[PDB]
Amino acid sequence: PLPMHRDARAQQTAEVVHAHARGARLTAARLGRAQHQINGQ
Amino acid sequence: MREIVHLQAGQCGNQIGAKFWEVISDEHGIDPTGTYHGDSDLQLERINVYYNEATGGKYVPRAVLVDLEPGTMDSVRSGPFGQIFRPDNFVFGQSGAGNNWAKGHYTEGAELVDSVLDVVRKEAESCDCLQGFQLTHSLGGGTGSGMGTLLISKIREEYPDRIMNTFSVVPSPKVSDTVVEPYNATLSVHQLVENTDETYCIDNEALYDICFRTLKLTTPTYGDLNHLVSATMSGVTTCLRFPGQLNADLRKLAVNMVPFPRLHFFMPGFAPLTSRGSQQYRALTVPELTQQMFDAKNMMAACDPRHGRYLTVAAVFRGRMSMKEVDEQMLNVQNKNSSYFVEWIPNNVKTAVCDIPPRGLKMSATFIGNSTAIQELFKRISEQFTAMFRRKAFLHWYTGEGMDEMEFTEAESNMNDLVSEYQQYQDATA
Amino acid sequence: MREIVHLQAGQCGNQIGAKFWEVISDEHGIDPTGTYHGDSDLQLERINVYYNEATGGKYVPRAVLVDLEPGTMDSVRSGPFGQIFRPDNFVFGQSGAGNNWAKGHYTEGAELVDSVLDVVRKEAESCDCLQGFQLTHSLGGGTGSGMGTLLISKIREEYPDRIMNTFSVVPSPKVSDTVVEPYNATLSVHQLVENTDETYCIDNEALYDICFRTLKLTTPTYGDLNHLVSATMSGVTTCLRFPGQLNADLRKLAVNMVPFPRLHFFMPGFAPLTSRGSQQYRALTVPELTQQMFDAKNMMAACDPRHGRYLTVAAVFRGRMSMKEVDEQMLNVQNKNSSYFVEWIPNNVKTAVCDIPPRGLKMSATFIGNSTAIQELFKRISEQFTAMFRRKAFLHWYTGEGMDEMEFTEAESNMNDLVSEYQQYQDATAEE
Amino acid sequence: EFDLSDPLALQKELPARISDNDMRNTISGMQKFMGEDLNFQERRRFQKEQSREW
Amino acid sequence: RKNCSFSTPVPLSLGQPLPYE
Amino acid sequence: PPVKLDALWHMPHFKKVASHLATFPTEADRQRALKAHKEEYAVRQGTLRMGNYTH
Amino acid sequence: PLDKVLEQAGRHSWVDITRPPTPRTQGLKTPPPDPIGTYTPACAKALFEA
Amino acid sequence: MRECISIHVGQAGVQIGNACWELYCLEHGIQPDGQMPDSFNTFFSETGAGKHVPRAVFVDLEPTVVDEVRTGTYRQLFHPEQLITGKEDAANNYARGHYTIGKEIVDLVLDRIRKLADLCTGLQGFLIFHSFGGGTGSGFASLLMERLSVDYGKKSKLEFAIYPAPQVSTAVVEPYNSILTTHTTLEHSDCAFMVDNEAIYDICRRNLDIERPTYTNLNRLIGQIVSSITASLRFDGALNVDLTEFQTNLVPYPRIHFPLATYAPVISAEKAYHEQLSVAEITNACFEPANQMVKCDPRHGKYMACCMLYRGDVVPKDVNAAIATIKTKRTIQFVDWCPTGFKVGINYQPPTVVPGGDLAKVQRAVCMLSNTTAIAEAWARLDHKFDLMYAKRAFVHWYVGEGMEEGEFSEAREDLAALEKDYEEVGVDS
Ligand SMILES: Nc1nc2c(ncn2[C@@H]2O[C@H](COP(=O)(O)OP(=O)(O)OP(=O)(O)O)[C@@H](O)[C@H]2O)c(=O)[nH]1
Ligand SMILES: Nc1nc2c(ncn2[C@@H]2O[C@H](COP(=O)(O)OP(=O)(O)O)[C@@H](O)[C@H]2O)c(=O)[nH]1
Ligand SMILES: Nc1nc2c(ncn2[C@@H]2O[C@H](COP(=O)(O)OP(=O)(O)O)[C@@H](O)[C@H]2O)c(=O)[nH]1
Ligand SMILES: [Mg+2]
Give the DSSP per-residue string, H404-415: --SHHHHHHHHH
To the nearest 10 degrees (0 to 180), the angle between helices B181-192 and B148-158 is 10
Radius of gyration, CA atoms only, chain F: 14
Known binding residue B204? Answer is yes
User: What is the spatial distance between Cα H425 and Cα B163, in angstroms, rounded to a whole number?
Assistant: 52
Give residues 326 to 355 of B whose Cβ lies within 8 Å of D. Answer: none
Quick one: residue B216, left, alpha or beta (phi over 0 = left, psi -120 to 50 = alpha)?
Answer: left
Q: What is the DSSP string of C242-288?
A: S--SB---HHHHHHHH-SSTT--EEEEEE-----TTTTTS----HHH
Hey, is C39 helix, strand or coil? coil
- Cβ atoms B136, B20 nearer than 8 A: yes
- Check pocket membership of C228 for ligand 3, CB cut-off 6 A: no
**Reduced to 3 states, what is the DSSP secondary structure of residue H253?**
coil
User: Cβ–Cβ contacts within 10 Å for residue C380, how many?
Assistant: 17
Give DSSP secondary structure letters for H61-117.
SSHHHHHHHHTSTTTTTS-TTSEE--SS--SS-TTHHHHTSGGGTHHHHHHHHHHHH
| CA distances (Å), origin B108, targets A4, B146, H210 | 23, 9, 49
User: Which residues of H are designated catalytic?
Assistant: 245
Query: Which residues of chain D make contact with B56, given a CB cutoff of 8 A?
Result: 11, 13-15
Please indicate whether residue H62, judged by its CB atom, sits closer than 6 Å to ligand 1: yes
Q: List the residue whose alpha carbon is closest to atom 10 of ligand 3.
A: C12
What is the distance in angstroms between the Cα of C20 and the nearest Cα belonging to chain D? 10
Q: How far is the CA of D38 from the CAs of C214, C274, D18, D41, H155, in angstroms? A: 18, 17, 16, 7, 74
Do C29 and C36 contact (CB within 8 A), yes or no? Answer: yes
Indicate whether residue H89 lines ligand 1 (CB < 6 A). Answer: yes
What letter would DSSP give residue A27?
H
Taking an 8 Å cut-off on Cβ atoms, the answer to whether A27 and G39 are in contact is: yes
Count of CB atoms within 10 A of residue H323's CB?
Answer: 15
Beta-bridged to residue C364, according to DSSP, are C318
The fourth-level CATH superfamily of domain B3-257 is Tubulin/FtsZ, GTPase domain (3.40.50.1440)
* CATH code, B265-374: 3.30.1330.20
Q: For residue B19, which of B57, B61, B67 has the smallest C-alpha distance?
A: B61
Q: Which of C346, C350, C356, C411 is CA-nearest to residue C378?
A: C411
Do C171 and C139 contact (CB within 8 A), yes or no?
A: yes
- Identify the three-state secondary structure at position C78: helix
Give me the residue from B86, B125, B126 closest to C281, CB to CB: B86
Report CA torsion sign: B231, B237, B239, B243.
Answer: negative
Calpha distance B378→B192 (Å, rounded)? 12
Report the relative pairing of strands B130-135 and B163-166 from DSSP bridges. parallel
Which helix or strand (DSSP H or E) is residue H306 part of? strand H303-312
Distance between CA atoms of H245 and B303, rounded to whole angstroms? Answer: 86
Whether C189 contacts C381, CB under 8 Å: yes
Pairing of strands B364-371, B269-270: antiparallel
Which of E2, E5, E6, E10 would best serve as a mutation to test chain C binding (most C beta carbons within 10 A)? E6
Determine contact, residues B369/B266, Cβ cutoff 8 Å. Answer: yes
Burial track H104-137 (b if 16+ CB lie within 10 A, e otherwise): ebeeebbebbeebbeebeebbbbbbbbbbbbbbb
Q: Distances from the Cα of H1 to the Cαs of C16, H24, H41, H119, H122, in angstroms?
A: 64, 18, 8, 12, 5
Query: For residues B165 and B21, is the Cβ–Cβ distance under 8 A?
Result: no
Q: What is B375-425's CATH number?
A: 1.10.287.600
Residues having CB within 6 Å of any atom of ligand 2: B 10-12, 15-16, 67, 97, 99, 138, 140-145, 169, 177, 204, 222, 225-226
> For residue C430, how far is its CA from the centre of ligand 1 (angstroms)?
30
Distance (Å, rounded) from C-alpha B244 to C-alpha B242? 7
Using the mean position of ligand 3's atoms as its centre, give its distance from the Cα of residue C144 in Å: 9
The percent helix, strand, coil of chain A (3-state, each to 5) is: 90, 0, 10
CA-based nearest distance F45→chain H, Å: 7
Q: What is the DSSP letter of G22?
A: P
Could you say which of C221, C283, C359 has the minimum Cβ distance to residue D34?
C221
Instruction: Report the alpha-carbon distance of residue B123 to residue B130 in Å, rounded.
Output: 9
DSSP calls for C190-203 = HHHHHS-SEEE-B-
Angle at C224 between CA C222 and CA C227, to 5 degrees: 115
Among candidate residues B134, B146, B122, the one with its CA nearest the CA of residue B68? B146
- Quote the CA–CA distance of C342 and C425 in Å, as a whole number: 9
**Do H25 and H67 touch, CB atoms closer than 8 A?**
no
CA distances from A28 to B35, C403, D9, F43, G6 (A): 50, 60, 52, 38, 10
The alpha carbon of residue C154 and the mean position of all alpha carbons in its chain are separated, in whole angstroms, by 20
DSSP states of H315-374 as a string? -HHHHHHHHHHHHS-TTS-B-TT-S--EE--EE-SPPP--TT-SSPP-SEEEEEEEEEST
Nearest-CA neighbor of H52 among H62, H63, H65, H42?
H42
H306, H261 in Cβ contact below 8 A?
Answer: no
How far is Cα H93 from Cα H177, in angstroms, rounded to an integer?
7
Q: CA–CA separation, B154 vs B117, rounded Å?
A: 9
Amino acid sitting at position C155: I
Question: Which residues sit directly before a break in chain B (C to N > 2.5 Å)?
Answer: none
- Residues of chain D contacting residue H209, judged by C-beta atoms under 8 Å apart: 5
Residues 6+ apart with CB under 8 A from C201: C168, C170, C265, C266, C267, C301, C302, C374, C377
Q: Apex CA H9: angle with CA H7 and CA H11, to 5°?
A: 140
User: What's the rounded Cα separation, in Å, for the pair C233 and C236?
Assistant: 5
DSSP letter (8 states) at residue C42? G
Helix (H, G, I), strand (E, B) or coil at H264: strand
Q: What b/e readout covers C392-414, taking b as 16+ CB neighbours within 10 angstroms?
A: eeeeeebeebeeeeeebeebbeb
Which ligand 3 atom sits closest to the C-alpha of C171? 23
B165 has binding-site annotation? no
Whole-number Cα distances in Å, B123 to B13, C186, H156: 19, 44, 56
Strand partners, H372: H303
Contact D16 C360 (CB under 8 A): yes
Nearest CA in chain F to H419: F19
Give me the count of residues in chain B.
430
CA H288 to chain centre: 20
Whether C2 contacts C131, CB under 8 Å? yes
CA–CA dist H112, H58 (Å, integer): 10
CA–CA separation, H398 and H407 (whole Å): 15
Can you tell me the distance from the alpha carbon of C18 to that of C276, in angstroms, rounded to the nearest whole number?
Answer: 26
For H177, half-sphere exposure in the C-beta direction (CA atoms, 13 angstrom radius) is 33
Question: Residue H299 in contact with residue F51, Cβ under 8 Å?
Answer: yes
State the DSSP string of B96-132: --SS-HHIIIIISHHHHHHHHHHHHHHHHHHSSSEEE
- Note the Cα H80 to chain centre separation in Å: 25
Nearest to C246 by CA among C173, C314, C156, C169: C314
Cis peptide before H316 (omega within 30 of 0): no
Please state, in angstroms and rounded to a whole number, the distance separating the CA atoms of residues C291 and B121.
11
C281, B60: Cβ pair inside 8 Å? yes
CB contact under 8 A, E3 and C82: no
Burial group, residue C419, by CB count within 10 angstroms (0-12, 13-18, 19+): middle
Q: Are H395 and H95 a contacting pair, CB within 8 Å?
A: no
CA distance B212 to B220: 8
Q: Are B398 and B196 in contact (CB under 8 A)?
A: no
Separation between Cα atoms, residue C142 and residue C160, nearest integer Å: 26
For the beta carbon of residue A28, count every other beta carbon within 10 angstroms.
14
Contact C360 D25 (CB under 8 A): yes
- Closest ligand 1 atom, residue H130 Cα: 19
Cβ-contact C26, C80 below 8 angstroms: no
- How far apart are the CA of B409 and the centre of ligand 2, in A? 27
How close is the Cα of B10 to the center of ligand 2, in Å?
Answer: 7
- Resolution (angstroms) equals 3.5
How far is residue H121 CA from its own chain's centroid? 25
Distance H51 CA to ligand 1 centre (A): 32
Q: What is the DSSP letter of B341?
A: B
Contacts of F13 in chain C (CB under 8 A): none
- What H or E segment, with its residue span, contains residue C315? strand C310-318
Radius of gyration, CA atoms only, chain D: 20
Rounded to whole angstroms, how far apart are CA atoms G37 and G44? 12
CA distance A27 to C347: 37
Which ranges of C28-78 does DSSP label H, i.e. alpha helix? 71-78
Tell me if E7 and C71 make a contact (CB, 8 A cut-off). yes
Q: Could you tell me the CA-to-CA distances from H185 to H38, H132, H374 in Å, in that order?
A: 34, 10, 18
Residues 6+ apart with CB under 8 A from H272: H265, H360, H362
CA-based radius of gyration for chain E: 8
Yes or no: say if H161 and H249 are a contact pair by the CB < 8 Å rule.
no
**Within 10 A of B293 (CB to CB), how many other CB atoms are there?**
20
Q: Are chains A and H in touch, 3+ Cβ pairs below 8 Å? A: no
In chain B, where the domains are located: 3-257, 265-374, 375-425
Choose among C349, C355, C136, C358: nearest CA to C253: C349
Which residues from chain G sit within 8 angstroms of residue B407, using beta carbons? none
**Rounded Cα–Cα distance for residues B196 and H40 (Å):** 72
- Say which experimental method was used: cryo-EM
H172 has a chain C CB within 8 A of its CB: yes
